[PDB]
Design a protein around this ligand. Structure first.
Ligand SMILES: [Zn+2]
Ligand SMILES: [Zn+2]
Ligand SMILES: [Zn+2]
Lengths: 224, 224
């Protein structure tokens, strides 16, 4: 599986699990004709689904539509269990980006039957993940200033700010830790903004992570 | 973090992920009035949900009923991806028991809304796992002669044999391997038979695992 990268070198703890939120951005719930949540939808992707974020993304081939979903990724550095938001902020080792790659037709069918989502979310290559970068934020306020951008084939595809999250980063993770204890090496996917859509072989993607409109990292890849 | 025991001694792998099958015993499907699918219901529990199988089983408190679901657990010894039944049999390092503890009321509501199952299946303590007993160059059909029994406060509660499985151990695991690559230290929960029901604080459980009618493990615990 591993490792994760933090500050351009290997993170000392192997990738554990990838805890994900559904529908953290209102416009993304609307674009798919889903009801905006009042509590978060929670699922988990396994270490076996992680791959480097580019230069190539391999997608499943004969299983219907495969969707890109860019999301702010959070690396957990210290164990969290039933944690406060202060404990969460002190635990975060860095921030990066992930693609929550989703077999969308498979998900539609799973959902309709009330079935678990793993077939659509946990497949090999389901979680391209960038390197993480340590940020020592000036106030808890600044967690609301994190941005993401996806471009596909040179053109705008997705953009979001953590300001827009229904469940902001710190309280989301604090709440997550109430349901599943979090260990060092765990990753959090904080939700995809509007603009999700299918991927085809040969699509090129360009992903950008920012802080108050300053670029933290950029990562590119082509679909194969 | 719960750690794997093979051969009454430590195992050189950390517990990875716990891959589970939904409705593998026709009778368990029926007792709950659930349709039998022609394809396996697949979900995954995280390493972080595993705990020792006894002497205590802790259960969530204010989230409705918690069901016991005894199942035959399979310890994956060698990597498996897109694998055949022969490779599966060579990869297996041993066999044990797991309790797929389940927030049934939470699971009912998630099903209704078409939400992922993690809240109901992946909470802390959701996966009590016994030690594993090594099986080596087993007879190619001893795989249909594994039995399990659960007792609850002295009375039989669950009983079954891998002969009764809709998706038999080897091709079930081969099939999982087509969707999620399996790494050494991953555990497979092969489905629970008829007899599921709630657990209450003070309940005591006794679980047995057999191979060709010879008991291999007896593990007890009380619910707290
Ligand atoms: Zn909660
Ligand atoms: Zn997502
Ligand atoms: Zn089960």
């Amino acid at each position: 599986m591993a490792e994760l990268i933090l500050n351009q070198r290997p993170y000392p703890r192997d990738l554990g699990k990838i805890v994900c939120v559904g529908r953290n951005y209102a416009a993304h719930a609307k674009e798919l004709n889903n009801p905006i949540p009042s509590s978060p939808i929670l699922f988990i992707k396994p270490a076996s689904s992680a791959v480097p974020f580019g230069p190539v993304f391999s997608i499943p081939k004969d299983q219907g539509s495969v969707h890109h979903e860019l999301e702010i990724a959070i690396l957990i550095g210290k164990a969290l269990s039933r944690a406060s938001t202060e404990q969460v902020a002190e635990s975060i080792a860095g921030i990066g980006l992930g693609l929550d790659l989703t077999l969308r037709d498979v998900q539609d069918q799973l959902k309709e039957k009330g079935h678990p989502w793993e077939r659509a979310k946990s497949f090999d290559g389901a979680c391209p993940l960038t390197e993480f970068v340590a940020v020592n934020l000036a106030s808890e306020d600044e967690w609301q200033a994190i941005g993401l951008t996806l471009e596909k084939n040179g053109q705008f595809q997705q953009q979001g700010s953590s300001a827009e999250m229904l469940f902001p980063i710190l309280p989301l993770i604090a709440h997550m830790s109430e349901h599943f204890s979090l260990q060092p090496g765990d990753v959090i996917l904080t939700g995809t903004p509007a603009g999700v859509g299918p991927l085809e072989v040969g699509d090129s993607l360009s992903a950008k992570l920012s802080l108050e409109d300053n670029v933290l990292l950029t990562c590119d890849g082509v679909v194969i």
